[PDB]
Copies of this chain bind each other. A is one copy, B any other.
Amino acid sequence: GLFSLDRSYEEVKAAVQQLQTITFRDATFTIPDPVIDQHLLIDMKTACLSMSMVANLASELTMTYVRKLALEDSSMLLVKCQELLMRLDRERVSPDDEIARLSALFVMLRQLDDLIREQVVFTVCDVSPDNKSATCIFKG
């Protein structure tokens, strides 16, 4: 889905084509392209946008608070966290807007949770030679 805007390039076409074919135990079916008619549908576009927006926001947001907590921290993981942000920084504000920015991060994080957490509905113990049928214990 994220490659939707670079589809005009041969590299992206090859990457997407290699992506579609998923290989599993004696199965080699292809998953259909979520991009159709050179366009993307609204919910998938919203998922990609929220994902990328969370990832972009976190970088700027966490840096101001990590140094304060590291000043307060005694377990040193926040200090190494600030060092990680320092190396990221080398590699590359009003208060109400700050509050709205944190709120935006978390409110769009709410949307993303659906794709982030798969749920198990059945686990199996019986398989037939009629294998298209099986017995499972149920969970919810």
Q: Which A residues are closer than 8 A to B by beta carbons?
A: 2-3, 5-7, 11-12, 14-15, 18-19, 41, 44-46, 48-49, 51-66, 68-69, 72-73, 75, 77-78, 81, 84-86, 88, 93, 95-96, 98-102, 104-106, 108-110, 112-113, 116-117, 137, 139-140
Contacts and interface: CB of A to CB of B under 8 A. Distances in A.
Contacts of A102: 2-3
Contact of A48 (B5, B51, B81, B96): B81
Contact of A2 (B5, B62, B96, B139): B62
Contacts of A14: 93, 95
B77 A46 contact: yes
